[PDB]
Amino acid sequence: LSFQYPDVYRDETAVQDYHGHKICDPYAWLEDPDSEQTKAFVEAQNKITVPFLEQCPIRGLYKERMTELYDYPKYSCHFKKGKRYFYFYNTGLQNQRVLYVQDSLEGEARVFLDPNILSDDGTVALRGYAFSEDGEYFAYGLSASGSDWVTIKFMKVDGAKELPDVLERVKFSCMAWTHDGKGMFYNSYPQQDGKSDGTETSTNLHQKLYYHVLGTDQSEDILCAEFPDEPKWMGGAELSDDGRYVLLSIREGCDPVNRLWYCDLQQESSGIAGILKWVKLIDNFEGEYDYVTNEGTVFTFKTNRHSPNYRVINIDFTDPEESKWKVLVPEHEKDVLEWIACVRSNFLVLCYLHDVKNTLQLHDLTTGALLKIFPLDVGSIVGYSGQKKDTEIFYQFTSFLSPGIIYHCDLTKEELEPRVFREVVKIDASDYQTVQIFYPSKDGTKIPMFIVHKKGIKLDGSHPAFLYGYGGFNISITPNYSVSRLIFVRHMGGILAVANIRGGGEYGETWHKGGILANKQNCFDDFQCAAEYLIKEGYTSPKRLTINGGSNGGLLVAACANQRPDLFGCVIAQVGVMDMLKFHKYTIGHAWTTDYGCSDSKQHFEWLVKYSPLHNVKLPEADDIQYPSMLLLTADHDDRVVPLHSLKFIATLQYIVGRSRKQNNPLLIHVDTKAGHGAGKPTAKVIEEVSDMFAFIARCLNVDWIP
Numbered sequence: 202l203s204f205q206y207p208d209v210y211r212d213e214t215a216v217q218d219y220h221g222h223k224i225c226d227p228y229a230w231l232e233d234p235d236s237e238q239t240k241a242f243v244e245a246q247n248k249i250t251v252p253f254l255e256q257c258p259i260r261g262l263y264k265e266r267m268t269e270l271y272d273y274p275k276y277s278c279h280f281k282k283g284k285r286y287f288y289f290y291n292t293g294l295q296n297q298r299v300l301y302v303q304d305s306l307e308g309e310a311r312v313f314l315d316p317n318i319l320s321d322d323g324t325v326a327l328r329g330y331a332f333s334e335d336g337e338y339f340a341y342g343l344s345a346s347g348s349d350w351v352t353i354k355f356m357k358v359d360g361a362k363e364l365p366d367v368l369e370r371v372k373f374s375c376m377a378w379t380h381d382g383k384g385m386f387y388n389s390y391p392q393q394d395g396k397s398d399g400t401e402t403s404t405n406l407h408q409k410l411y412y413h414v415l416g417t418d419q420s421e422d423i424l425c426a427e428f429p430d431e432p433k434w435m436g437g438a439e440l441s442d443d444g445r446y447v448l449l450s451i452r453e454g455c456d457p458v459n460r461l462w463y464c465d466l467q468q469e470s471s472g473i474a475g476i477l478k479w480v481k482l483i484d485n486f487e488g489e490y491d492y493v494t495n496e497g498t499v500f501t502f503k504t505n506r507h508s509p510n511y512r513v514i515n516i517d518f519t520d521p522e523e524s525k526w527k528v529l530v531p532e533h534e535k536d537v538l539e540w541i542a543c544v545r546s547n548f549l550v551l552c553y554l555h556d557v558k559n560t561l562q563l564h565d566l567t568t569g570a571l572l573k574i575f576p577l578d579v580g581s582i583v584g585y586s587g588q589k590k591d592t593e594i595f596y597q598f599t600s601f602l603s604p605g606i607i608y609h610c611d612l613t614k615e616e617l618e619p620r621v622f623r624e625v626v627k628i629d630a631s632d633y634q635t636v637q638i639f640y641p642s643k644d645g646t647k648i649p650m651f652i653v654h655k656k657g658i659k660l661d662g663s664h665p666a667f668l669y670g671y672g673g674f675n676i677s678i679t680p681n682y683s684v685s686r687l688i689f690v691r692h693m694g695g696i697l698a699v700a701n702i703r704g705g706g707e708y709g710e711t712w713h714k715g716g717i718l719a720n721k722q723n724c725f726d727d728f729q730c731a732a733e734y735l736i737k738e739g740y741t742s743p744k745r746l747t748i749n750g751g752s753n754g755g756l757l758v759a760a761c762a763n764q765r766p767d768l769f770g771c772v773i774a775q776v777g778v779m780d781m782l783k784f785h786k787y788t789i790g791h792a793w794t795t796d797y798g799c800s801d802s803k804q805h806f807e808w809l810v811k812y813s814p815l816h817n818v819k820l821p822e823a824d825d826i827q828y829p830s831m832l833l834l835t836a837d838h839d840d841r842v843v844p845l846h847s848l849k850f851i852a853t854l855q856y857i858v859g860r861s862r863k864q865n866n867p868l869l870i871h872v873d874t875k876a877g878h879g880a881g882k883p884t885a886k887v888i889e890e891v892s893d894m895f896a897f898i899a900r901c902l903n904v905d906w907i908p
């Protein structure tokens with residue numbers, strides 16, 4: 202190799218006992234982000250990775266092309282608040298998109314909130330916001346350096362006037378104004394020792410629900426709900442459309458279930474003055490209940506209660522027993538109800554997932570009957586606006602081969618006419634083909650996969666491929682426009698693939714349950730079978746195949762590298778969960794035990810230890826097999842998945858596998874600064890990251906640039 206791996210001390214005395222099973226953790230010390238030892242480790246690692254990537258002549262070519270092609274106007278849906286319209290817009294290469302305001306759709310827009318002026322490198326980003334019911338006041342969250350921590354600030358909308366109000370210690374928070382305009386619900390965590398900036402690893406427990414009265418200090422905020430005996434519970438508030446009820450959704454973890462309590466605000470003795478008079482309508486974690494709208498005491502919810510593909514029910518608060526609920530929109534046999542919104546008083550907009558593609562349609566609130574289908578090409582809905590009081594909808598559609606397009610429909614009209622509102626890269630979609638196939642996994646289950654490539658290629662195994670997966674947390678991986686991936690097709694001759702493996706939401710809760718807990722290994726088997734399909738069918742060959750995933754997808758590709766190193770040429774794991782025995786100890790990791798289990802349980806430990814990437818690094822038995830080239834990407838403010846996961850994993854890879862004489866493929870990490878898990882990352886950093894990724898592939902697989 203062009204470089205030498207850093208010295209990394211092994212604490213051979215570090216052992217944890219798990220129900221009698223001893224696990225050695227010689228790099229446990231990398232769990233302390235503040236030590237001189239850990240800082241020295243990160244610096245030494247970056248010092249080998251950066252020259253390796255930057256020496257690849259493809260990196261500069263890729264970066265230039267990405268900078269050119271990503272430079273196109275990006276608009277969000279318009280949305281109306283009070284008498285004004287708002288929308289986000291990026292002129293092309295701004296680090297953060299900017300919020301604009303206008304007095305009508307025809308009116309001249311002006312800047313309302315520009316996050317770019319809050320830093321010099323675009324690393325302060327918006328994270329959550331809420332307008333008051335009348336649209337005259339505005340709360341917004343700010344996150345620095347990509348941390349999940351939020352500071353909430355406030356503006357008067359008329360004149361875009363900054364207000365003094367500031368809320369600290371906010372994380373994983375609701376933002377909900379009471380319709381009297383007096384104040385806003387939000388969540389905070391109690392003060393903790395050490396840092397709260399995203400570089401700490403401290404577990405987040407005892408989240409509370411507070412109410413902030415506009416024009417007061419945070420110290421005076423009213424505590425409205427707390428769960429002293431249930432440190433993991435998190436209670437989010439929303440107001441009913443008529444302003445009468447606070448609905449509290451209590452969550453215990455990342456499971457699609459919640460308790461649902463309500464407070465009739467008219468029944469408070471003296472306004473919001475302390476713990477509210479909660480009525481515990483649904484006081485268990487057996488199902489999800491997501492508020493859509495109400496008409497008096499009849500409340501409409503999206504639910505998965507006895508309905509793994511989701512359905513719409515009405516619960517009457519005056520007769521709340523489950524036998525009495527009405528099924529407004531029954532469950533479909535295969536299509537998953539993703540979300541539903543009430544608009545124009547008595548319409549419902551329903552978004553379904555049909556074989557991993559979105560559909561959109563309009564239903565009647567009173568009967569649930571279908572009224573109108575909104576035609577879409579094959580792709581995803583990634584934005585929507587239209588509240589109960591609104592008389593129009595906007596929605597944003599995206600696909601693999603065309604950028605986002607915004608549609609508008611005036612719902613006041615007899616003849617409903619969905620029309621293009623905003624359409625914008627100077628890329629010919631006709632040069633590419635997209636297909637969806639279904640391949641059998643190990644157990645026979647058919648798994649969907651999308652494949653995108655240049656039209657007319659020969660399936661002779663000669664092409665480099667980029668195979669992406671996630672597989673968890675009920676997240677569905679649906680088509681989206683990616684300039685970075687298309688550059689790999691056009692300028693590196695590549696084939697793109699996304700495998701819709703189990704654990705995701707693509708086929709509802711049964712699909713999710715097929716990739717969790719004792720069945721987590723299904724995710725990895727599904728993904729390995731996707732690779733085998735691409736190889737058998739002649740799209741690629743193992744030495745030419747790159748796999749990529751982020752977060753739970755980082756776990757995916759890391760486990761696959763350990764289990765089938767022969768199947769892959771290159772692995773890029775972004776912000777991955779690698780220590781499956783300790784993940785629950787840090788920040789919000791406790792919430793993930795609903796998908797993974799927890800090593801505190803003897804039963805769950807036996808699942809986890811079999812696939813935990815950190816614990817399954819092993820030299821391939823066969824002399825002709827080495828590990829694939831591997832690149833781990835993380836950042837120093839990733840407080841979602843603390844970076845120790847990647848630090849410990851790369852130390853282990855370099856020691857166990859990197860020292861072997863047969864290992865010639867590099868095993869590298871890069872740890873970025875002023876960045877976190879990914880949300881809110883500035884454009885400049887996104888461009889650098891994708892350039893790093895495709896330079897790694899180019900160098901490791903010796904791929905030529907195609908001008």
Ligand SMILES: O=C([C@@H]1C=Cc2c(Cl)nc(OCc3ccc(F)cc3)c(=O)n21)N1CCCC1
Pocket residue numbers: 373435452453454455674752753778789792793841842
């Ligand atoms: O980030 C996550 C998961 C997946 C989506 C998500 C969200 Cl939206 N919020 C998360 O945390 C906030 C939260 C909010 C409410 C709640 F009930 C539990 C957690 C969260 O942890 N997650 N990881 C899972 C694998 C490693 C990272």
